[PDB]
Design a protein around this nucleic acid. Structure first.
Ligand SMILES: [Mg+2]
Length: 48
DNA sequence: GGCGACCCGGCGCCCGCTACGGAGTCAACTACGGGTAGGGGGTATCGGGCAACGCGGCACTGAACACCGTTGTCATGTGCCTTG
């Protein structure tokens, strides 16, 4: 997702189970490593 | 005469979402006959508006008895005086 111009859908987990999964499984901070080859993907390089 | 290419048909698909324009189009006819449906007309049936009149507590009716309280009342008992 570059910032040239891009829209991103936002979805709402409703049930207690859904927000539980989103809190535990689908969290942004528990997916540092890319599943393709198990290397970091959450440290981009453009500016920092 | 099954192999064989080849030929052909015939089919199967062809990243993701939002968000983003409108446009809308060429050749019968009449007669009948019914039946439904509308309209108003009139009619039986259901629904809305009022004071007595159901109640009840108690209250008055005190009236007529009852419940103590009272000073009415009586015939009948002590104390002093007179005579045996
Ligand atoms: Mg982009």
């Amino acid at each position: 997702a570059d910032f040239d111009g891009d829209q991103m859908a936002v979805h709402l987990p409703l049930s207690a189970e859904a927000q539980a999964e989103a809190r535990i499984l689908m969290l942004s901070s528990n997916n540092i490593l890319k599943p393709a080859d198990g290397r970091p993907v959450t440290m981009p390089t453009q500016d920092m």
